[PDB]
Amino acid sequence: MSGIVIDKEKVHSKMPDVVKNAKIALIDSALEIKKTEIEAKVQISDPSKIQDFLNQETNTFKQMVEKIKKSGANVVLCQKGIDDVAQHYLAKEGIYAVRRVKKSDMEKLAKATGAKIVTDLDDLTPSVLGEAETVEERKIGDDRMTFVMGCK
Amino acid sequence: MSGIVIDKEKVHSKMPDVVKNAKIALIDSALEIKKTEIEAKVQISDPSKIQDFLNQETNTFKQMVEKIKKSGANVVLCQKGIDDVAQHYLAKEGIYAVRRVKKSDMEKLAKATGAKIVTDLDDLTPSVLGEAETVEERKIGDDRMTFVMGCK
Ligand code: NA
Numbered sequence A, B: 001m002s003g004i005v006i007d008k009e010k011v012h013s014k015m016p017d018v019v020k021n022a023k024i025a026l027i028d029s030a031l032e033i034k035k036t037e038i039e040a041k042v043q044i045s046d047p048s049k050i051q052d053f054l055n056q057e058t059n060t061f062k063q064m065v066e067k068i069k070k071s072g073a074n075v076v077l078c079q080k081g082i083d084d085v086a087q088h089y090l091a092k093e094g095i096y097a098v099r100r101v102k103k104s105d106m107e108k109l110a111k112a113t114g115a116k117i118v119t120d121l122d123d124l125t126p127s128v129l130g131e132a133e134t135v136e137e138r139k140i141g142d143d144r145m146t147f148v149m150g151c152k
């Protein structure tokens, strides 16, 4: 596809404007921390270990987020939200990230670029990535969208 | 009092062995994070703000802990537990900290050194501190205790 338009913009300003030869990651699941799960770990914690836990979780999440960079990807389109700090990590890692991409677009992009839409970020092997000549921010009218061109 | 023995040891190894001219802080309350309170802030949080919160809390607590160093104190005897990371902060700040000091000892030390046992760590003015010539770790038999000598 010498074109697929996504009506969603890259999440951070400090993110790349154009991405040449993009390996694209497709995640079904939100790049976020599960409330119920960390509340419970806080609840079952030894009172003197509360901060240890919050710190171990700050590391565990950042690691979950780095599995994108480590799988080689330089573009990530998430079907759901992306935690704000997670958005920071990717902006630093220089990755083009998009959140809340419609399910239809996720599938449309899956076929077009050849990626496999994962949910569990551990199955994020560099084989499930998609490819495209360029991925760019584009502003039509007052919408900031993302063009996925040269779909391979 | 050319002597008050406390049957509790300084909390960390990297803490001072002897503290000359000690201004002593007495806290009724635990130097810990309240479970119920942070669980609720996690629960009411925008999903994309979970990590922002955990980070703001990591700072808020460290600041609560620094109010000891900032009140001038160089010795803190807490009547309850002290969060492990909080114990790290004090060990770095070079403060002699003791946790779970008996209530009777807290009062006994209050009179002897002239400090005011606070609960709310904001009332930790340098006026509520106690004084003593030396505060030292001491090992009698197989107990590691704390001697508060030269109580002024
Ligand atoms: Na899907």
Ligand code: NA
Pocket: B028, B103, B106, B107, B117
């Ligand atoms: Na008391």
